[PDB]
Amino acid sequence: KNPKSDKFKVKRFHHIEFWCGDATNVARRFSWGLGMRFSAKSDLSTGNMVHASYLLTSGDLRFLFTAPYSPSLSAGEIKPTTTASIPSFDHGSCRSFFSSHGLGVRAVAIEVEDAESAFSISVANGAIPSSPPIVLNEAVTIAEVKLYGDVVLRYVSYKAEFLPGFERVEDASSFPLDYGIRRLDHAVGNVPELGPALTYVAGFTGFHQFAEFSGLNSAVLASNDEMVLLPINEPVHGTKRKSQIQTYLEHNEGAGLQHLALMSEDIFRTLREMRKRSSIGGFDFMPSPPPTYYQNLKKRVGDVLSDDQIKECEELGILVDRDDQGTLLQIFTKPLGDRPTIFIEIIQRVGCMMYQSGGCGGFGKGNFSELFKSIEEYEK
Amino acid sequence: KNPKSDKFKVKRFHHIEFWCGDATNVARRFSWGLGMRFSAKSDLSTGNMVHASYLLTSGDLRFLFTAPYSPSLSAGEIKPTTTASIPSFDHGSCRSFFSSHGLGVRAVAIEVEDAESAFSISVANGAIPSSPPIVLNEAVTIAEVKLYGDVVLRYVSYKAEFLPGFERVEDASSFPLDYGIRRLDHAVGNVPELGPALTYVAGFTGFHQFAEFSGLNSAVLASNDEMVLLPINEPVHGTKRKSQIQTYLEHNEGAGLQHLALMSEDIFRTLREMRKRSSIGGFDFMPSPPPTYYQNLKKRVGDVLSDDQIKECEELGILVDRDDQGTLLQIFTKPLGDRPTIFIEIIQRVGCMMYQSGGCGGFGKGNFSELFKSIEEYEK
Numbered sequence: 001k002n003p004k005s006d007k008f009k010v011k012r013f014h015h016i017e018f019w020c021g022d023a024t025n026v027a028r029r030f031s032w033g034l035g036m037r038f039s040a041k042s043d044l045s046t047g048n049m050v051h052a053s054y055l056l057t058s059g060d061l062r063f064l065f066t067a068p069y070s071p072s073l074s075a076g077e078i079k080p081t082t083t084a085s086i087p088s089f090d091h092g093s094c095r096s097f098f099s100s101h102g103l104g105v106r107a108v109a110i111e112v113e114d115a116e117s118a119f120s121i122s123v124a125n126g127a128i129p130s131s132p133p134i135v136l137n138e139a140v141t142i143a144e145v146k147l148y149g150d151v152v153l154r155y156v157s158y159k160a161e162f163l164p165g166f167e168r169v170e171d172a173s174s175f176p177l178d179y180g181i182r183r184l185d186h187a188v189g190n191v192p193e194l195g196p197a198l199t200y201v202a203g204f205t206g207f208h209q210f211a212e213f214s215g216l217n218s219a220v221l222a223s224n225d226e227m228v229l230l231p232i233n234e235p236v237h238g239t240k241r242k243s244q245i246q247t248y249l250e251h252n253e254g255a256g257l258q259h260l261a262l263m264s265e266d267i268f269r270t271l272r273e274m275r276k277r278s279s280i281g282g283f284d285f286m287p288s289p290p291p292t293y294y295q296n297l298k299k300r301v302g303d304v305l306s307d308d309q310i311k312e313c314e315e316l317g318i319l320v321d322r323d324d325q326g327t328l329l330q331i332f333t334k335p336l337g338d339r340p341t342i343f344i345e346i347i348q349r350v351g352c353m354m355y356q357s358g359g360c361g362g363f364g365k366g367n368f369s370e371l372f373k374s375i376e377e378y379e380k
Numbered sequence: 381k382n383p384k385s386d387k388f389k390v391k392r393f394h395h396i397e398f399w400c401g402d403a404t405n406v407a408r409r410f411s412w413g414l415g416m417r418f419s420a421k422s423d424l425s426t427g428n429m430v431h432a433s434y435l436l437t438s439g440d441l442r443f444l445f446t447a448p449y450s451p452s453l454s455a456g457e458i459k460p461t462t463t464a465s466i467p468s469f470d471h472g473s474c475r476s477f478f479s480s481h482g483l484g485v486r487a488v489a490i491e492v493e494d495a496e497s498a499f500s501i502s503v504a505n506g507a508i509p510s511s512p513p514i515v516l517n518e519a520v521t522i523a524e525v526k527l528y529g530d531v532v533l534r535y536v537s538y539k540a541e542f543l544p545g546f547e548r549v550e551d552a553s554s555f556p557l558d559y560g561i562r563r564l565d566h567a568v569g570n571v572p573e574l575g576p577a578l579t580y581v582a583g584f585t586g587f588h589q590f591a592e593f594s595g596l597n598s599a600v601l602a603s604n605d606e607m608v609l610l611p612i613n614e615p616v617h618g619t620k621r622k623s624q625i626q627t628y629l630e631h632n633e634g635a636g637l638q639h640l641a642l643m644s645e646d647i648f649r650t651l652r653e654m655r656k657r658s659s660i661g662g663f664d665f666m667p668s669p670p671p672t673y674y675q676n677l678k679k680r681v682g683d684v685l686s687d688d689q690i691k692e693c694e695e696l697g698i699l700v701d702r703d704d705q706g707t708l709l710q711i712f713t714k715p716l717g718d719r720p721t722i723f724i725e726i727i728q729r730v731g732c733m734m735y736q737s738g739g740c741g742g743f744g745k746g747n748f749s750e751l752f753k754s755i756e757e758y759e760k
């Protein structure tokens with residue numbers, strides 16, 4: 001049941017902004033590890049005396065990495081005279097954000113038809129304002145509201161290249177890395193209480209609940225066409241194994257973004273490329289499910305995947321689950337930084353062709369059962 | 381003239397510790413970019429609730445990358461009950477250090493015969509104490525005094541693997557990267573006034589001035605055998621081109637470590653390996669000197685280098701200068717992080733065989749002249 005209750009025209013995921021201690025080093029690590037190209041910069045060399053911001057792109061996926069310079073560099077400036085290309089930036093907020101959470105996502109950015117109206121409607125509908133709409137060079141408008149914890153949902157809209165004040169990067173500094181990742185599929189938040197979080201965000205967006213088929217309860221909010229997907233988790237206390245959501249909240253000092261799901265146009269090549277680089281600067285992956293998990297795969301998705309594609313799944317450690325609508329291939333990295341907080345998920349969806357509809361195959365919740373009922377190989 | 385006036389037995393450079401926002405991401409970047417192996421860890425997985433510390437090694441070169449966790453994780457601990465493996469660590473100092481300077485070197489560590497006595501003698505001789513001697517597990521003793529700005533000179537001594545509480549890293553997480561770098565040759569500080577800095581450090585170490593053959597004045601302090609080498613620079617104001625030392629001091633918020641000189645056992649393979657990786661996560665190098673600089677190289681070092689080695693120097697952008705004692709091959713990276721502050725120098729020394737004596741060939745001061753008198757190619 002899709003009631004199509006968006007309160008403003010929401011287009012697509014536009015970018016994800018990390019707040020870092022040092023943007024250069026995180027961005028270069030992510031570039032190698034994920035296969036993303038250096039696309040745009042705003043820093044000292046572009047006149048920005050306030051922050052360093054570097055953009056990586058892969059297909060439609062945009063990762064923005066931002067860190068503050070010394071406040072002294074911009075001591076004479078005021079907000080009207082700022083050289084920051086992202087006027088919502090604030091040294092005190094960024095240092096407090098990073099000191100409090102460590103490396104993680106500050107902004108989940110979505111493109112809307114009119115950022116000023118989306119901000120006005122949102123706040124009128126319960127959104128906590130974070131940064132009011134600002135018009136960059138008569139061309140781009142950006143506005144921010146609180147999402148959960150210190151994460152903001154950022155609205156961007158264009159009259160008609162990333163943002164004004166960013167420069168395209170000279171191509172000799174821009175090596176065309178690509179491991180197949182093409183767009184952001186969904187972005188997941190962890191909160192201490194799901195209900196009030198759901199009520200708040202659904203409240204000011206009009207996003208509807210997306211239908212689903214140990215440790216947490218979750219739910220998914222979605223825009224009209226279900227291209228913007230925002231799952232949210234809460235912990236379930238009192239279990240046998242401690243909730244990883246609870247571990248997240250402890251180490252992150254509260255609510256925040258748990259993981260980013262990146263859609264690959266060929267998940268097998270992406271995982272081959274990423275695994276080759278795990279131990280030489282890239283990302284590590286969670287431990288692989290046992291071979292019994294893969295001995296049981298022929299029976300539920302042998303429909304969709306050949307024996308060859310199934311055996312390739314076992315090599316790369318890929319997990320597979322299925323909706324009534326499509327099939328989902330997924331895998332999870334280990335945490336991206338020091339803290340056991342943010343990680344990345346690689347995914348590819350098969351089915352639901354109309355273009356492909358969002359959430360096709362769901363989010364893998366069928367894999368808790370498939371996984372637990374596979375650790376019965378410890379008796380095999 | 382070497383008066384051999386060390387006030388305590390100084391052995392060798394032991395390690396360099398960076399204070400980071402996120403140790404994981406800086407360490408993985410440095411590992412790929414420089415060819416260093418993941419060797420030791422102290423973090424949550426080893427019981428350290430206070431900081432994450434990762435060690436990279438290449439030959440004798442040890443780079444330590446440290447970042448604080450949330451203070452909350454260790455709120456119940458006191459210094460006697462600390463889980464930090466480096467008891468000099470302090471959340472407030474590290475966050476203040478990093479917020480103030482950004483990514484850079486916190487500790488220049490040298491191995492001494494007795495860290496407690498070296499600390500006592502130092503302070504008795506004018507050193508500002510930073511962290512008093514602590515004995516780690518009846519085996520290792522560590523003590524810290526102020527060097528310049530917020531950089532500490534760290535004394536370590538062993539009764540008889542890096543430090544207690546560090547774990548060796550499982551070899552599947554430890555890929556044997558190596559591009560030829562073998563040890564730290566010297567570590568360079570920038571200060572607003574050279575004289576008082578020189579007086580202070582020579583004061584409590586007994587290190588002597590090392591004899592030399594636009595923008596700055598400098599001098600070099602050295603231990604008895606001249607294996608520990610500590611150049612220090614100050615700016616010269618009023619020039620035509622602004623002092624880069626002054627630019628350093630502005631962006632670093634004051635004095636600090638300018639660059640690390642890493643000795644390669646084969647600088648041509650190191651630079652080939654590093655340049656291949658510049659645009660895919662590694663380090664960038666300063667612009668190459670003009671071909672006229674290389675057309676003039678046959679006349680001064682054609683003695684030491686073949687036409688082939690000279691043409692290889694032009695390919696890799698290597699600079700070459702010469703003492704009366706030896707020949708020095710060097711090159712400089714661009715800044716390692718967001719700020720135009722810390723960078724790295726790659727070097728290899730030829731000559732002064734006795735083992736090779738320290739500073740053989742000097743530090744390249746002859747290249748200001750060779751470089752300026754080469755930009756007369758803009759008229760060629």
Ligand SMILES: CC(C)=CC[C@@H](O)C1=CC(=O)c2c(O)ccc(O)c2C1=O
Binds near residue numbers: 216343345363365
């Ligand atoms: C293996 C790991 C570090 C975390 C997995 C787990 O926390 C998780 C990931 C996820 O992606 C997801 C959804 O996408 C949707 C519902 C839902 O319960 C979940 C999840 O539980």
Ligand SMILES: CC(C)=CC[C@@H](O)C1=CC(=O)c2c(O)ccc(O)c2C1=O
Binds near residue numbers: 596725
């Ligand atoms: C190209 C660049 C970013 C910086 C070069 C310059 O700042 C420099 C480097 C250096 O290594 C050095 C010595 O090793 C010794 C004396 C001395 O004056 C110097 C230097 O001036």
Ligand SMILES: [Co+2]
Binds near residue numbers: 188363
């Ligand atoms: Co997911």
Ligand SMILES: [Co+2]
Binds near residue numbers: 641725743
């Ligand atoms: Co040098």
